[PDB]
Nucleic acid binder design. Structure first.
Ligand SMILES: [Mg+2]
Ligand SMILES: [Mg+2]
Ligand SMILES: [Zn+2]
Ligand SMILES: [Zn+2]
Ligand SMILES: [Zn+2]
Ligand SMILES: [Zn+2]
Lengths: 162, 162
DNA sequence: TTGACTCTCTTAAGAGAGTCA
DNA sequence: TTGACTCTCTTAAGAGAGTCA
């Protein structure tokens, strides 16, 4: 098995490579009518992506390193968390984009949490709008707001009570 | 079926049948430390479910009627909305449980909205905790809260900024 | 050892359609 | 005509693994 030192070396090589990705400045809602700035380190749209990186899906990538003749591969956003527990409350941990920018690989924009916690950030009011996430959101979720509901609750007769 | 009269007759038959489902009282968090009460009309756990109803999945049902000598079938929660647009901004409209109780078929607990709007209600703070849904939530979402994040954003080196 | 592709899978909110009796 | 089953699919947040040179 890879040793702690070998895992640290994987994380360090990943950081070195991602740190050279184009850094894109994005202005983002924080909640409470305030605007902030996030700096995303974006993997390229097409090959080559960077040493060790390859695309396995439209917005999915993997990082690969060969150590002592054995090929090891990880989801491209999971690398910062290789020294962390991989499950919690019986749920698999997932890499969760605090910046909501799938191509971004900035580890300061990622956290490691259940898929439900991950998804829920899409609707968070944001760090200046009432976020209650213990690991705080960096921005208001892109789907926060009144929504676009086409039809609300309704009955034609009198068979029901709320 | 095709005619407005036929569609109204389908909605009316559905309401009459669902109106005879057992009414189960559920006390629910509203947000803001307040509690409310919902009356869910719950489809049975096993056959028979009611005239026109059959289970297509562990928590999935369909309603069917024979009109013009042909079988017409719908997802069991979609029937209240047969006269509504079936899409919004190019996204499919879905039946969305305001009570977060799949077996419930009370139309006073359903709305018709995109899957994203639907999902997002799982994390809403609720009608007394800051819900901003234009079609208001009936309760705080079951997944609202601080989450259980295992690891937050972090870097080993000095290549990244927020 | 490395790059650039290929494929299918998970989850939990939701769907459509076919086989028998 | 009605009932009770069977199967696979959609979405958008996420995954693992194979092939070839
Ligand atoms: Mg996410
Ligand atoms: Mg729902
Ligand atoms: Zn980012
Ligand atoms: Zn948050
Ligand atoms: Zn209900
Ligand atoms: Zn709400």
């Amino acid at each position: 098995a890879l040793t702690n030192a070998q895992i640290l070396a994987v994380i360090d090589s990943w950081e070195e490579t991602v740190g050279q990705f184009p850094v894109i400045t994005h202005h983002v809602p924080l909640g409470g009518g305030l605007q902030g700035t996030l700096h995303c380190y974006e993997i390229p749209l097409a090959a080559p992506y960077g040493v060790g990186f390859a695309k396995n899906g439209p917005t999915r990538w993997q990082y690969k390193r060969t150590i002592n003749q054995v090929v090891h591969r990880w989801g491209s956003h999971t690398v910062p968390f290789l020294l962390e527990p991989d499950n919690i409350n019986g749920k698999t941990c997932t890499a969760s984009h605090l910046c909501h920018n799938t191509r971004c690989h900035n580890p300061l924009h990622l956290c490691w949490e259940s898929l439900d916690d991950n998804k829920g950030r899409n609707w968070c009011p944001g760090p200046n709008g009432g976020c209650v996430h213990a690991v705080v959101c960096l921005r208001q979720g892109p789907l926060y707001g009144p929504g676009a509901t086409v039809a609300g609750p309704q009955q034609r007769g009198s068979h029901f009570v709320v």
